[PDB]
Amino acid sequence: NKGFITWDDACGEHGFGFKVKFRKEYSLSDNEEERHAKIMKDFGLIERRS
Amino acid sequence: GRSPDGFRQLTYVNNIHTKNGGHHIDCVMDDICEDLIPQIKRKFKIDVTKARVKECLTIVMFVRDMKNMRFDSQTKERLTSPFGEIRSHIQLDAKKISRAILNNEAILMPIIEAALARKLAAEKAAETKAAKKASKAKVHKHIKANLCGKDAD
Amino acid sequence: IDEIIDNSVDEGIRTKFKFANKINVTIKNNQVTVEDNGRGIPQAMVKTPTGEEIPGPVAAWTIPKAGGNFGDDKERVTGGMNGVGSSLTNIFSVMFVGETGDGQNNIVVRCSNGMENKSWETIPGKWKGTRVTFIPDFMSFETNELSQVYLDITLDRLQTLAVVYPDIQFTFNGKKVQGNFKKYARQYDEHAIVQEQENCSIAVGRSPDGFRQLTYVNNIHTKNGGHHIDCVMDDICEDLIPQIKRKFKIDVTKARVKECLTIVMFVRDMKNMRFDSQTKERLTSPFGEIRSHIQLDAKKISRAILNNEAILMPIIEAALARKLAAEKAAETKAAKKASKAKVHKHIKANLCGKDADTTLFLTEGDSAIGYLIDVRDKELHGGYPLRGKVLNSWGMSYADMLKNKELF
Numbered sequence: 001n002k003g004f005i006t007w008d009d010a011c012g013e014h015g016f017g018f019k020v021k022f023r024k025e026y027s028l029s030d031n032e033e034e035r036h037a038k039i040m041k042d043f044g045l046i047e048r049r050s
Numbered sequence: 051g052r053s054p055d056g057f058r059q060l061t062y063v064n065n066i067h068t069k070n071g072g073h074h075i076d077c078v079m080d081d082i083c084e085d086l087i088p089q090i091k092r093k094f095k096i097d098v099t100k101a102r103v104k105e106c107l108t109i110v111m112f113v114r115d116m117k118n119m120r121f122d123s124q125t126k127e128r129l130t131s132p133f134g135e136i137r138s139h140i141q142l143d144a145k146k147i148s149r150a151i152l153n154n155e156a157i158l159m160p161i162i163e164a165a166l167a168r169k170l171a172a173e174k175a176a177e178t179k180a181a182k183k184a185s186k187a188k189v190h191k192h193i194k195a196n197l198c199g200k201d202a203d
Numbered sequence: 204i205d206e207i208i209d210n211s212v213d214e215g216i217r218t219k220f221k222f223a224n225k226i227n228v229t230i231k232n233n234q235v236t237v238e239d240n241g242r243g244i245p246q247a248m249v250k251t252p253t254g255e256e257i258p259g260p261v262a263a264w265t266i267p268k269a270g271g272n273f274g275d276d277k278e279r280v281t282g283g284m285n286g287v288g289s290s291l292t293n294i295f296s297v298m299f300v301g302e303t304g305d306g307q308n309n310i311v312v313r314c315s316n317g318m319e320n321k322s323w324e325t326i327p328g329k330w331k332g333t334r335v336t337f338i339p340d341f342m343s344f345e346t347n348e349l350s351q352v353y354l355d356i357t358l359d360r361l362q363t364l365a366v367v368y369p370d371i372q373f374t375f376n377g378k379k380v381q382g383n384f385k386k387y388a389r390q391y392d393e394h395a396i397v398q399e400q401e402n403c404s405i406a407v408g409r410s411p412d413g414f415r416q417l418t419y420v421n422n423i424h425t426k427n428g429g430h431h432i433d434c435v436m437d438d439i440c441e442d443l444i445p446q447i448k449r450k451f452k453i454d455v456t457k458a459r460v461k462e463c464l465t466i467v468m469f470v471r472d473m474k475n476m477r478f479d480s481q482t483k484e485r486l487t488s489p490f491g492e493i494r495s496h497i498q499l500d501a502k503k504i505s506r507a508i509l510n511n512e513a514i515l516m517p518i519i520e521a522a523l524a525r526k527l528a529a530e531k532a533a534e535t536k537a538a539k540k541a542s543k544a545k546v547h548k549h550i551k552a553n554l555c556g557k558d559a560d561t562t563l564f565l566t567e568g569d570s571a572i573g574y575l576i577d578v579r580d581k582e583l584h585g586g587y588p589l590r591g592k593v594l595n596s597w598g599m600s601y602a603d604m605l606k607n608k609e610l611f
């Protein structure tokens with residue numbers, strides 16, 4: 001809803017299969033340090049439990 | 051009087067009729083409505099606008115022997131007298147007219163009956179229902195393959 | 204102020220938009236400075252019936268019944284018909300200076316003490332225009348100083364007249380104003396339909412608490428209108444009211460149709476104008492001349508506000524507020540049909556009313572009342588089933604517990 005990115009439902013057999021399409025206003029960073037950190041800050045891959 | 055189908059009026063400034071109007075009549079509706087509209091609002095809890103109650107009445111006034119009357123028209127159809135001279139000479143007590151038209155039910159009753167449909171109306175509730183009349187809903191609760199539209203099997 | 208303003212505008216329009224195109228207005232602290240680069244009043248000699256030889260601008264500014272607007276009505280496009288206007292401006296002013304350059308000379312008229320002092324002088328110069336700077340008489344008017352609501356009036360009038368005439372550029376206290384009919388229509392209402400011609404420009408909007416208008420004949424603010432808006436609104440309504448009668452079968456009266464509009468009408472380049480007063484607030488011209496001059500397609504306005512539900516559907520819903528609100532059926536779409544007082548489903552014992560030790564069973568369904576009919580004592584034990592699902596009890600008014608069937 002921010003307009004940053006869009007997604008489409010293509011869920012497979014094992015796990016998930018969602019296909020993510022990048023729009024133009026976002027960081028679109030490089031160097032594979034800050035783009036991955038922006039992914040785990042934005043897509044929420046890193047999850048913490050107790 | 052009464053007027054169910056538009057605005058009617060009758061004005062005489064001294065011996066001269068204004069079929070168009072003037073500024074003493076604005077004082078007459080002002081002094082009548084300033085005593086009438088809060089009294090009707092306290093009586094039947096209705097909020098009807100000044101134009102909506104102005105178009106429902108006819109007023110016939112006869113004015114005799116007032117000084118420095120002014121007319122911009124060659125037919126003298128608009129009394130352009132100032133409000134100071136009009137309010138100084140016209141000593142018409144409008145609160146007795148307001149309480150006299152308050153005691154007459156020949157005007158307010160069908161309008162109040164129409165208002166009673168909404169104002170002070172009995173509640174209904176129950177199953178109101180809704181005719182949303184469907185929607186397109188293409189992307190919701192359906193499976194979209196990547197070949198949606200292309201020539202395939 | 205409007206007399207000097209329309210004198211500058213008439214000087215602009217008498218030369219077909221080539222002089223007096225820049226009119227500067229400066230009204231601050233009881234002093235008015237209004238100038239334009241027109242031809243002005245020339246140095247040519249204008250004679251008096253008394254026999255005295257009085258020059259041009261001083262006879263235009265001090266003596267009434269003087270002007271170049273006393274010509275034929277079939278050719279004149281200016282709105283002036285009196286000759287008394289700048290004398291009316293100068294009489295109620297305690298200080299006045301006025302300069303008119305004609306391209307060869309400046310003529311400066313200084314007036315004071317309410318036509319006890321007036322003096323005209325001729326200075327050599329190369330100016331071509333008119334400038335009037337006066338300080339008004341406060342012992343005649345019921346005021347002592349100038350307030351900002353009059354300056355708001357002057358600013359809105361200059362905005363309006365700039366929308367009427369975009370060739371003439373007006374500046375109020377050194378501040379320029381542009382004139383467009385679209386921004387003037389959209390200051391009014393956001394859905395005001397525009398309709399422009401080579402001589403006409405009319406926008407239709409909304410008036411929710413009465414009726415509103417602002418119409419212009421040439422260069423005069425006709426706040427009382429005239430025959431022009433009567434003919435144009437009859438031409439719009441004679442196509443509009445049958446169209447809404449075909450639309451939603453409600454015969455809305457003509458006052459009730461036209462009562463929900465605001466109209467922005469600016470008319471340019473008209474001839475043979477007639478107003479009934481020196482106040483000039485309303486047009487008494489014959490309708491044949493106005494109808495021959497106006498080539499505005501009013502049926503375009505009628506079809507362009509017929510489909511516009513932002514204006515028309517408030518009138519039709521007010522008709523629904525006085526006729527479909529009178530079309531009363533009083534339901535809630537729950538089950539519709541007849542509003543029964545008491546349904547036929549009823550089990551009544553013979554002790555319905557007396558003081559005894561009887562009971563009523565509010566049991567469930569026709570099964571339990573079938574077993575109850577097969578079981579109970581007719582004198583002692585009663586019964587009643589329930590029709591179905593009942594909702595939450597305290598979300599509903601006591602008159603709506605009276606609207607509910609099984610509770611009744």
Ligand SMILES: Nc1ncnc2c1ncn2[C@@H]1O[C@H](COP(=O)(O)OP(=O)(O)NP(=O)(O)O)[C@@H](O)[C@H]1O
Nearest residue numbers: 210263269270271272282283284285286287288289
């Ligand atoms: N500053 C001026 N600029 C141009 N013409 C002027 C000026 N002052 C006076 N006049 C002339 O003198 C007249 C002013 O008196 P006025 O009563 O305005 O006459 P009118 O224009 O014929 N009538 P009206 O505008 O309806 O009041 C105008 O008609 C002009 O011809």
